[PDB]
Design a protein around this ligand. Sequence first.
Ligand code: OC9
Length: 157
Amino acid sequence: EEASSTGRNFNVEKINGEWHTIILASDKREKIEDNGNFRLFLEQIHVLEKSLVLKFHTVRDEECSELSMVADKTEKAGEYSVTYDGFNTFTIPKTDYDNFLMAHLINEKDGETFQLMGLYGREPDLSSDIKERFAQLCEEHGILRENIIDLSNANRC
Ligand SMILES: CCCCCCCCO
């Protein structure tokens, strides 16, 4: 079964655990390029009562550094918010729990905004079919494929 965090049958506990950043996308490409603050390699999600603890690592000159964030449920079911390089809110428009998870995030900083979409997998890579389904979801949000970056060959330290 596949669900959306904003959907009725969403079971948040099933997204608990190991995850890896497979692809990142944004309508402001620089945010996810080599030294962008949003090029985050997810490692795990810990589901709590009213929040999610996210553990990522970033890379600089080939050196990895850890970083955690706490995303809190907002008043919309399926939506979370977190402060990180501005104010962010995000939902999970699609996940199948066992293989992939697709997130859509809105960042607001200095009075501006931008969209970020991420494809995460239980293993360090995903099938080309799942990657194509992710490209279609990006297109539904006005994000061009040239703004979609596959990081599956650079997500392990
Ligand atoms: C469950 C994780 C949602 C996506 C957060 C991505 C932030 C860095 O690109």
